[PDB]
Short mmCIF file of C-alpha atoms and ligand atoms in Angstrom, two decimals:
data_model
loop_
_atom_site.label_atom_id
_atom_site.label_comp_id
_atom_site.label_asym_id
_atom_site.label_seq_id
_atom_site.Cartn_x
_atom_site.Cartn_y
_atom_site.Cartn_z
CA UNK A 1 69.79 -34.09 -23.08
CA UNK A 2 68.97 -35.57 -25.73
CA UNK A 3 69.83 -33.54 -29.24
CA UNK A 4 67.89 -34.95 -32.49
CA UNK A 5 69.28 -33.02 -35.88
CA UNK A 6 65.95 -33.34 -38.88
CA UNK A 7 67.52 -32.72 -42.05
CA UNK A 8 67.16 -34.14 -45.28
CA UNK A 9 69.61 -36.60 -47.34
CA UNK A 10 72.52 -34.34 -47.96
CA UNK A 11 75.44 -31.70 -47.10
CA UNK A 12 72.91 -28.47 -47.18
CA UNK A 13 71.38 -26.51 -44.37
CA UNK A 14 72.06 -28.62 -41.35
CA UNK A 15 75.77 -28.90 -42.09
CA UNK A 16 76.11 -25.56 -39.81
CA UNK A 17 74.43 -28.07 -36.80
CA UNK A 18 75.98 -30.73 -36.86
CA UNK A 19 79.85 -29.28 -37.36
CA UNK A 20 79.62 -27.31 -34.58
CA UNK A 21 77.88 -29.52 -32.13
CA UNK A 22 80.82 -31.32 -33.13
CA UNK A 23 83.29 -29.14 -32.23
CA UNK A 24 81.67 -28.79 -29.32
CA UNK A 25 81.50 -32.32 -28.71
CA UNK A 26 77.69 -32.81 -27.56
CA UNK A 27 75.86 -35.57 -28.60
CA UNK A 28 72.82 -35.32 -30.78
CA UNK A 29 70.78 -38.17 -32.63
CA UNK A 30 70.80 -37.28 -36.38
CA UNK A 31 67.88 -37.77 -38.40
CA UNK A 32 68.01 -37.88 -42.37
CA UNK A 33 63.86 -37.96 -43.93
CA UNK A 34 64.08 -39.58 -47.17
CA UNK A 35 62.98 -37.85 -50.23
CA UNK A 36 59.33 -40.85 -49.77
CA UNK A 37 59.05 -40.25 -46.37
CA UNK A 38 58.53 -36.16 -46.23
CA UNK A 39 55.32 -35.64 -47.70
CA UNK A 40 54.35 -37.78 -44.02
CA UNK A 41 56.69 -36.51 -41.82
CA UNK A 42 56.48 -32.76 -42.73
CA UNK A 43 53.33 -32.02 -40.89
CA UNK A 44 54.82 -33.15 -37.89
CA UNK A 45 56.70 -30.57 -37.80
CA UNK A 46 56.65 -27.35 -36.71
CA UNK A 47 57.14 -25.13 -39.48
CA UNK A 48 56.63 -27.75 -42.10
CA UNK A 49 60.66 -26.89 -43.04
CA UNK A 50 63.91 -28.78 -41.92
CA UNK A 51 66.06 -28.26 -40.73
CA UNK A 52 64.62 -28.54 -36.63
CA UNK A 53 65.88 -29.16 -33.73
CA UNK A 54 64.42 -30.94 -31.34
CA UNK A 55 65.69 -30.82 -27.68
CA UNK A 56 64.36 -33.11 -25.21
CA UNK A 57 65.18 -33.16 -21.49
CA UNK A 58 65.03 -35.85 -18.38
CA UNK A 59 61.93 -34.17 -16.65
CA UNK A 60 59.69 -34.37 -20.77
CA UNK A 61 60.66 -30.73 -21.91
CA UNK A 62 60.46 -30.89 -24.53
CA UNK A 63 61.48 -27.78 -27.35
CA UNK A 64 61.73 -27.57 -31.59
CA UNK A 65 64.08 -25.23 -32.95
CA UNK A 66 64.13 -23.97 -36.27
CA UNK A 67 66.11 -21.40 -39.05
CA UNK A 68 69.38 -23.83 -39.84
CA UNK A 69 72.97 -20.70 -38.92
CA UNK A 70 69.70 -19.92 -36.12
CA UNK A 71 70.17 -22.97 -33.64
CA UNK A 72 74.34 -23.01 -35.28
CA UNK A 73 74.38 -19.29 -33.52
CA UNK A 74 73.26 -20.51 -30.56
CA UNK A 75 74.95 -23.10 -29.57
CA UNK A 76 78.01 -21.94 -31.16
CA UNK A 77 77.09 -18.64 -28.95
CA UNK A 78 76.23 -21.75 -25.56
CA UNK A 79 79.88 -23.30 -25.72
CA UNK A 80 81.87 -20.54 -26.33
CA UNK A 81 81.88 -20.24 -30.07
CA UNK A 82 80.66 -16.93 -31.02
CA UNK A 83 84.32 -15.02 -29.65
CA UNK A 84 84.94 -13.46 -26.36
CA UNK A 85 84.25 -10.33 -26.82
CA UNK A 86 82.40 -7.44 -28.93
CA UNK A 87 85.45 -7.13 -31.74
CA UNK A 88 86.07 -10.98 -32.06
CA UNK A 89 81.98 -11.91 -32.40
CA UNK A 90 82.40 -9.42 -35.53
CA UNK A 91 84.95 -11.24 -37.34
CA UNK A 92 83.29 -14.44 -36.40
CA UNK A 93 79.99 -12.48 -37.89
CA UNK A 94 81.99 -11.35 -40.83
CA UNK A 95 83.43 -14.28 -42.23
CA UNK A 96 80.02 -15.12 -41.58
CA UNK A 97 78.19 -13.40 -43.94
CA UNK A 98 80.87 -14.00 -46.34
CA UNK A 99 80.60 -17.31 -46.85
CA UNK A 100 77.17 -17.13 -46.96
CA UNK A 101 77.07 -15.02 -49.63
CA UNK A 102 79.40 -17.77 -51.22
CA UNK A 103 76.63 -19.91 -50.71
CA UNK A 104 74.12 -17.91 -51.89
CA UNK A 105 75.77 -18.21 -55.50
CA UNK A 106 76.11 -21.73 -55.17
CA UNK A 107 72.52 -21.89 -54.84
CA UNK A 108 72.45 -20.95 -57.65
CA UNK A 109 73.39 -23.96 -59.43
CA UNK A 110 70.88 -25.87 -57.88
CA UNK A 111 67.97 -27.61 -59.11
CA UNK A 112 68.31 -26.94 -62.64
CA UNK A 113 68.81 -28.77 -66.21
CA UNK A 114 72.20 -30.14 -66.81
CA UNK A 115 72.07 -27.22 -69.73
CA UNK A 116 71.67 -23.80 -67.50
CA UNK A 117 73.68 -25.82 -64.49
CA UNK A 118 76.81 -25.05 -66.63
CA UNK A 119 75.92 -21.73 -67.80
CA UNK A 120 75.77 -20.60 -64.14
CA UNK A 121 78.70 -22.71 -63.03
CA UNK A 122 80.40 -21.25 -65.37
CA UNK A 123 78.58 -17.69 -64.16
CA UNK A 124 79.39 -17.99 -60.81
CA UNK A 125 82.51 -19.04 -60.87
CA UNK A 126 84.06 -16.65 -63.87
CA UNK A 127 82.05 -14.20 -61.84
CA UNK A 128 81.51 -12.83 -57.93
CA UNK A 129 82.90 -16.97 -56.83
CA UNK A 130 86.31 -15.45 -57.44
CA UNK A 131 85.72 -11.93 -56.21
CA UNK A 132 83.70 -14.48 -52.50
CA UNK A 133 87.17 -15.68 -52.11
CA UNK A 134 89.27 -13.83 -51.78
CA UNK A 135 86.76 -11.07 -49.45
CA UNK A 136 87.32 -14.55 -46.77
CA UNK A 137 91.44 -14.81 -47.55
CA UNK A 138 91.50 -10.77 -46.93
CA UNK A 139 89.38 -12.03 -43.58
CA UNK A 140 92.05 -15.12 -42.11
CA UNK A 141 95.38 -13.17 -42.67
CA UNK A 142 93.39 -10.79 -40.60
CA UNK A 143 93.25 -13.13 -37.57
CA UNK A 144 95.74 -12.65 -34.95
CA UNK A 145 95.55 -16.60 -34.81
CA UNK A 146 96.27 -20.04 -36.14
CA UNK A 147 91.86 -19.12 -37.28
CA UNK A 148 88.95 -17.98 -38.67
CA UNK A 149 88.96 -15.37 -35.61
CA UNK A 150 91.84 -16.32 -32.48
CA UNK A 151 92.88 -19.88 -32.34
CA UNK A 152 89.73 -20.73 -31.30
CA UNK A 153 87.19 -23.26 -33.45
CA UNK A 154 83.85 -20.46 -34.18
CA UNK A 155 80.96 -21.03 -35.90
CA UNK A 156 83.01 -18.84 -38.82
CA UNK A 157 85.70 -22.24 -38.98
CA UNK A 158 82.87 -24.41 -39.49
CA UNK A 159 80.67 -22.61 -42.17
CA UNK A 160 83.21 -21.46 -44.05
CA UNK A 161 84.60 -25.35 -44.46
CA UNK A 162 81.18 -25.75 -45.63
CA UNK A 163 80.78 -23.99 -47.71
CA UNK A 164 84.37 -24.24 -49.94
CA UNK A 165 83.00 -27.93 -50.25
CA UNK A 166 80.25 -26.61 -51.88
CA UNK A 167 81.93 -24.26 -54.04
CA UNK A 168 84.72 -27.51 -54.73
CA UNK A 169 81.19 -29.97 -55.74
CA UNK A 170 80.98 -28.04 -58.89
CA UNK A 171 84.53 -27.67 -59.34
CA UNK A 172 86.85 -29.48 -58.45
CA UNK A 173 89.98 -27.83 -58.93
CA UNK A 174 89.28 -24.04 -58.75
CA UNK A 175 91.36 -23.87 -55.27
CA UNK A 176 94.00 -25.25 -56.23
CA UNK A 177 97.01 -23.41 -56.61
CA UNK A 178 95.14 -20.74 -55.38
CA UNK A 179 93.14 -18.80 -52.44
CA UNK A 180 96.62 -20.21 -50.32
CA UNK A 181 95.01 -18.21 -46.40
CA UNK A 182 92.05 -20.82 -47.34
CA UNK A 183 93.53 -24.28 -47.89
CA UNK A 184 95.78 -23.02 -44.52
CA UNK A 185 92.88 -22.24 -42.99
CA UNK A 186 91.53 -26.33 -43.08
CA UNK A 187 94.72 -27.56 -42.20
CA UNK A 188 95.20 -25.37 -39.16
CA UNK A 189 91.36 -26.78 -38.30
CA UNK A 190 91.56 -30.14 -38.46
CA UNK A 191 94.29 -30.30 -36.75
CA UNK A 192 92.55 -27.71 -33.43
CA UNK A 193 89.83 -30.42 -33.46
CA UNK A 194 90.23 -33.89 -33.44
CA UNK A 195 86.66 -34.57 -33.46
CA UNK A 196 85.85 -32.05 -36.68
CA UNK A 197 88.87 -34.05 -38.72
CA UNK A 198 87.45 -37.39 -37.81
CA UNK A 199 84.23 -36.20 -38.26
CA UNK A 200 85.03 -35.43 -42.19
CA UNK A 201 86.63 -38.47 -42.18
CA UNK A 202 83.32 -40.12 -41.57
CA UNK A 203 80.24 -38.40 -43.70
CA UNK A 204 78.74 -40.99 -46.11
CA UNK N 1 83.39 8.38 -32.89
CA UNK N 2 82.43 9.84 -35.89
CA UNK N 3 80.23 6.96 -37.81
CA UNK N 4 80.48 7.43 -41.70
CA UNK N 5 78.19 4.79 -43.58
CA UNK N 6 78.95 4.85 -47.38
CA UNK N 7 77.07 2.69 -49.07
CA UNK N 8 75.04 3.25 -53.32
CA UNK N 9 71.51 5.72 -53.14
CA UNK N 10 68.44 3.49 -51.95
CA UNK N 11 67.35 0.62 -49.53
CA UNK N 12 69.34 -1.94 -49.84
CA UNK N 13 72.39 -4.49 -47.39
CA UNK N 14 73.16 -0.32 -45.45
CA UNK N 15 69.47 -0.17 -44.10
CA UNK N 16 70.23 -2.67 -41.60
CA UNK N 17 73.24 -0.60 -40.47
CA UNK N 18 71.34 2.94 -40.39
CA UNK N 19 67.90 1.35 -38.37
CA UNK N 20 69.75 -0.62 -35.94
CA UNK N 21 71.43 3.21 -35.48
CA UNK N 22 68.83 5.16 -35.56
CA UNK N 23 66.79 2.62 -33.03
CA UNK N 24 69.89 2.44 -31.19
CA UNK N 25 69.85 7.19 -30.48
CA UNK N 26 73.10 7.47 -32.18
CA UNK N 27 75.02 10.01 -35.10
CA UNK N 28 76.11 8.76 -37.75
CA UNK N 29 77.72 10.18 -41.82
CA UNK N 30 75.12 9.22 -44.45
CA UNK N 31 77.59 8.70 -47.54
CA UNK N 32 75.62 7.64 -50.82
CA UNK N 33 78.01 6.61 -53.59
CA UNK N 34 76.56 7.11 -57.07
CA UNK N 35 77.36 4.66 -59.52
CA UNK N 36 79.65 6.76 -61.81
CA UNK N 37 81.08 8.31 -58.49
CA UNK N 38 82.20 4.33 -57.21
CA UNK N 39 84.70 3.54 -59.56
CA UNK N 40 87.36 6.47 -58.51
CA UNK N 41 86.14 5.22 -54.68
CA UNK N 42 86.35 2.00 -54.92
CA UNK N 43 89.87 1.29 -54.67
CA UNK N 44 90.34 3.76 -50.92
CA UNK N 45 87.23 1.23 -49.42
CA UNK N 46 89.13 -1.85 -48.07
CA UNK N 47 87.08 -4.67 -50.71
CA UNK N 48 85.56 -2.88 -52.51
CA UNK N 49 82.45 -3.30 -52.13
CA UNK N 50 79.49 -1.70 -50.39
CA UNK N 51 77.82 -0.33 -47.77
CA UNK N 52 82.12 -0.25 -45.58
CA UNK N 53 81.55 1.87 -42.25
CA UNK N 54 83.91 3.55 -41.70
CA UNK N 55 84.56 4.66 -37.57
CA UNK N 56 87.21 7.19 -36.50
CA UNK N 57 87.75 8.04 -32.82
CA UNK N 58 88.52 11.83 -30.79
CA UNK N 59 92.51 10.70 -31.14
CA UNK N 60 92.81 9.75 -34.07
CA UNK N 61 91.65 5.10 -34.74
CA UNK N 62 90.21 4.31 -38.61
CA UNK N 63 88.48 1.78 -37.41
CA UNK N 64 86.55 0.11 -41.41
CA UNK N 65 83.36 -2.52 -41.12
CA UNK N 66 82.64 -4.45 -44.25
CA UNK N 67 79.97 -6.98 -43.98
CA UNK N 68 76.40 -4.71 -43.78
CA UNK N 69 74.91 -7.33 -41.03
CA UNK N 70 77.52 -8.52 -39.12
CA UNK N 71 77.95 -4.72 -38.46
CA UNK N 72 74.22 -4.55 -37.34
CA UNK N 73 74.22 -7.18 -35.16
CA UNK N 74 78.10 -5.48 -33.49
CA UNK N 75 76.15 -2.31 -32.93
CA UNK N 76 73.08 -4.04 -31.88
CA UNK N 77 74.66 -6.34 -29.64
CA UNK N 78 76.75 -3.13 -28.11
CA UNK N 79 73.19 -1.49 -26.86
CA UNK N 80 71.53 -4.64 -26.01
CA UNK N 81 68.97 -4.95 -29.51
CA UNK N 82 70.20 -8.83 -29.58
CA UNK N 83 68.46 -10.48 -27.18
CA UNK N 84 69.10 -10.65 -23.21
CA UNK N 85 69.37 -14.10 -22.78
CA UNK N 86 69.70 -17.13 -24.61
CA UNK N 87 66.53 -17.87 -25.17
CA UNK N 88 66.06 -14.45 -26.73
CA UNK N 89 69.11 -13.98 -28.75
CA UNK N 90 67.96 -17.17 -30.42
CA UNK N 91 64.48 -15.78 -31.48
CA UNK N 92 66.36 -12.87 -32.58
CA UNK N 93 68.73 -14.76 -35.18
CA UNK N 94 65.77 -16.87 -35.78
CA UNK N 95 63.36 -13.67 -37.20
CA UNK N 96 66.91 -12.22 -39.26
CA UNK N 97 67.57 -15.90 -40.95
CA UNK N 98 63.36 -15.87 -42.03
CA UNK N 99 64.05 -12.19 -43.13
CA UNK N 100 66.91 -12.86 -44.85
CA UNK N 101 65.89 -15.80 -46.70
CA UNK N 102 62.30 -13.61 -47.83
CA UNK N 103 64.85 -11.35 -49.01
CA UNK N 104 67.20 -13.85 -50.53
CA UNK N 105 64.10 -14.27 -53.62
CA UNK N 106 63.45 -10.33 -53.26
CA UNK N 107 66.54 -10.24 -54.98
CA UNK N 108 66.07 -12.78 -57.09
CA UNK N 109 64.08 -9.90 -59.09
CA UNK N 110 66.84 -7.38 -59.09
CA UNK N 111 68.92 -6.18 -62.69
CA UNK N 112 66.50 -8.40 -65.06
CA UNK N 113 64.75 -6.84 -67.90
CA UNK N 114 61.34 -6.25 -67.01
CA UNK N 115 60.08 -9.28 -68.97
CA UNK N 116 61.92 -11.82 -67.26
CA UNK N 117 61.57 -9.65 -64.27
CA UNK N 118 57.75 -10.20 -63.99
CA UNK N 119 57.89 -13.98 -65.21
CA UNK N 120 60.18 -14.44 -61.38
CA UNK N 121 57.88 -12.66 -59.45
CA UNK N 122 55.25 -14.06 -60.43
CA UNK N 123 56.66 -17.45 -59.19
CA UNK N 124 58.39 -15.89 -56.39
CA UNK N 125 55.09 -14.78 -54.85
CA UNK N 126 52.90 -17.84 -56.34
CA UNK N 127 56.03 -19.40 -54.39
CA UNK N 128 58.18 -19.65 -51.80
CA UNK N 129 57.53 -15.62 -50.20
CA UNK N 130 54.15 -16.79 -48.80
CA UNK N 131 55.20 -19.54 -47.19
CA UNK N 132 57.64 -17.62 -45.77
CA UNK N 133 55.84 -14.38 -44.61
CA UNK N 134 53.61 -16.99 -42.71
CA UNK N 135 56.63 -18.67 -41.26
CA UNK N 136 57.01 -14.86 -39.99
CA UNK N 137 53.90 -14.73 -38.86
CA UNK N 138 54.56 -17.42 -36.38
CA UNK N 139 57.42 -16.94 -34.98
CA UNK N 140 55.80 -13.07 -34.19
CA UNK N 141 52.45 -15.25 -32.56
CA UNK N 142 55.86 -16.37 -30.06
CA UNK N 143 57.22 -13.23 -29.26
CA UNK N 144 56.41 -12.41 -24.94
CA UNK N 145 55.86 -9.24 -26.13
CA UNK N 146 54.29 -6.56 -28.88
CA UNK N 147 58.55 -6.19 -30.63
CA UNK N 148 59.28 -9.37 -32.53
CA UNK N 149 60.89 -10.58 -29.55
CA UNK N 150 59.43 -9.23 -25.87
CA UNK N 151 58.89 -5.53 -25.57
CA UNK N 152 62.60 -3.80 -26.44
CA UNK N 153 63.75 -3.63 -30.25
CA UNK N 154 66.41 -5.69 -31.58
CA UNK N 155 67.70 -6.27 -34.67
CA UNK N 156 64.35 -8.46 -36.03
CA UNK N 157 62.59 -5.96 -35.93
CA UNK N 158 64.35 -3.79 -38.34
CA UNK N 159 65.75 -6.31 -40.65
CA UNK N 160 61.71 -6.76 -40.84
CA UNK N 161 60.54 -4.68 -41.64
CA UNK N 162 62.97 -3.33 -44.41
CA UNK N 163 62.24 -7.16 -45.79
CA UNK N 164 58.63 -6.32 -45.89
CA UNK N 165 59.63 -2.63 -47.76
CA UNK N 166 61.72 -5.50 -50.70
CA UNK N 167 58.23 -7.23 -50.33
CA UNK N 168 55.85 -4.57 -50.87
CA UNK N 169 58.22 -2.94 -53.73
CA UNK N 170 57.60 -6.28 -56.05
CA UNK N 171 53.06 -6.25 -55.33
CA UNK N 172 51.91 -3.24 -53.45
CA UNK N 173 49.52 -5.25 -51.87
CA UNK N 174 50.46 -8.74 -51.74
CA UNK N 175 49.84 -8.20 -47.36
CA UNK N 176 47.01 -6.19 -48.06
CA UNK N 177 44.21 -7.89 -45.85
CA UNK N 178 47.02 -11.17 -45.06
CA UNK N 179 49.83 -11.44 -42.45
CA UNK N 180 47.39 -9.38 -38.93
CA UNK N 181 50.80 -10.34 -37.59
CA UNK N 182 53.43 -8.80 -39.44
CA UNK N 183 50.68 -5.49 -40.09
CA UNK N 184 50.26 -5.23 -35.87
CA UNK N 185 54.07 -5.77 -35.17
CA UNK N 186 54.98 -2.61 -37.72
CA UNK N 187 52.37 -0.98 -35.64
CA UNK N 188 54.18 -1.87 -32.19
CA UNK N 189 57.59 -1.02 -34.06
CA UNK N 190 56.71 2.67 -34.83
CA UNK N 191 54.82 3.58 -31.70
CA UNK N 192 57.81 1.95 -29.76
CA UNK N 193 60.36 4.02 -31.62
CA UNK N 194 59.16 7.41 -32.18
CA UNK N 195 63.53 7.76 -33.34
CA UNK N 196 62.93 5.38 -36.12
CA UNK N 197 59.14 6.83 -37.41
CA UNK N 198 60.43 9.95 -37.80
CA UNK N 199 63.64 8.18 -40.02
CA UNK N 200 60.90 6.24 -41.94
CA UNK N 201 58.97 9.31 -42.90
CA UNK N 202 61.64 11.41 -43.67
CA UNK N 203 63.46 8.89 -45.95
CA UNK N 204 63.99 10.03 -49.27
N1 GSH B 301 66.20 -20.44 -43.84
C1 GSH B 301 66.30 -22.46 -43.99
C2 GSH B 301 65.59 -22.73 -44.33
C3 GSH B 301 65.31 -24.36 -44.59
C4 GSH B 301 64.67 -24.24 -45.76
O1 GSH B 301 64.88 -24.15 -46.87
N2 GSH B 301 64.33 -25.95 -46.30
C5 GSH B 301 63.21 -26.20 -47.18
C6 GSH B 301 65.10 -26.88 -47.46
S1 GSH B 301 64.14 -28.35 -48.57
C7 GSH B 301 62.84 -27.03 -47.05
O2 GSH B 301 62.43 -27.45 -45.40
N3 GSH B 301 61.65 -27.20 -48.01
C8 GSH B 301 60.37 -27.88 -47.69
C9 GSH B 301 58.96 -28.43 -46.81
O3 GSH B 301 60.00 -29.09 -46.11
O4 GSH B 301 58.37 -29.10 -48.01
C10 GSH B 301 67.10 -22.16 -43.15
O5 GSH B 301 68.55 -22.62 -43.17
O6 GSH B 301 66.53 -23.27 -42.11
N1 GSH B 302 77.27 -9.79 -48.39
C1 GSH B 302 76.68 -7.94 -48.22
C2 GSH B 302 78.04 -8.05 -49.79
C3 GSH B 302 77.84 -6.58 -50.10
C4 GSH B 302 77.11 -6.02 -51.48
O1 GSH B 302 77.00 -6.74 -53.22
N2 GSH B 302 78.33 -5.38 -52.18
C5 GSH B 302 78.53 -5.11 -54.26
C6 GSH B 302 76.96 -4.64 -53.92
S1 GSH B 302 76.37 -3.20 -55.27
C7 GSH B 302 78.99 -4.77 -53.94
O2 GSH B 302 79.63 -3.63 -52.99
N3 GSH B 302 79.80 -4.27 -55.91
C8 GSH B 302 80.74 -4.29 -56.61
C9 GSH B 302 81.68 -3.54 -56.65
O3 GSH B 302 82.05 -2.95 -54.86
O4 GSH B 302 82.32 -2.74 -56.83
C10 GSH B 302 76.93 -7.19 -47.32
O5 GSH B 302 75.78 -6.93 -46.99
O6 GSH B 302 77.59 -6.34 -47.59
#
């Protein structure tokens, strides 16, 4: 199957999809759409929104998928990255939900004039952000292995790395000297997934 | 097992958990915590946040669960409400993600003075809300059965009903004469789940 991932230029919602395929060792085509080209392409995308995934097989079948984390969960399940038991499934989902909570705080800062952007950053960094980082640390602490859940890569590992990258976009040193569990998780994940480490280093 | 669901007084994040147990016919204890009693109870809750679920078996084991939709997904999976195939799993998750997007627009209106609350309501109702309602309508259209995904209740059905209830909290008539798929889905769901219909009618 040819898998084409269609998104805007950056690590936004598509990152969960990209990292899942990378970690699972699945080949795919990147299609980054520029702001200027979007109006033309928008009507050709079922549902008119990105990320979208177009899967084409060698017998002419075309499957369109939308909703970034639903795509990511589907692919993760296919490649045994959603937990091997019900309990591990719950713990995978628990960390995804916590990471997504944190992501929504980050979202508050987007498409705002610099002036109120810094006010929001200060608000969230003095409010919900450290609360969620600690809660995530507790989730990581409870793992029986080196990763979010056990010793094998799950979607939870991938969503966490992406959201932490957004936190450090807001304040580069926010995690410095703090949250040892999150730092250790990043080390362990990159150690366990050379494919992901290479991907993260290569990223434009 | 005794299942105790702990939340604040209302339909907020706990609703997905409550509706899942109701639809699956699982008995549980409701524990609603008042604003005034929260400070005392907060330290006794692992992670210090609600919803939380405490499950106690008849051999003294105590299991604590947090993160509302991770709990809901876990319970839904246990009771065959997350899809019967990978494709149905994806479609369940697609509608959950769409419904949660809509929920986050609703969240924008919370804990705001009446003045800017109405400005935000007008903004979202003229912006992302109708966009997401239509996208949800398309998801429903693509079902092979009467419900969100097939003919049997899934977590997607339940999350959708709860989020639509929040939209109508903001504007009672927003769906009137519009979004026929959403109206039909509500009818079909209540028809298919007398347990849920009774629960929704009884709600305080
Ligand atoms: N629930 C999201 C929704 C994606 C979304 O918000 N897409 C926006 C990203 S800019 C979009 O494509 N918007 C407007 C447009 O397509 O014109 C997902 O994770 O896929
Ligand atoms: N991701 C959410 C997080 C829940 C949450 O935001 N809980 C708030 C609801 S008011 C809370 O308990 N907050 C503050 C406190 O416990 O003092 C979930 O769905 O469970």
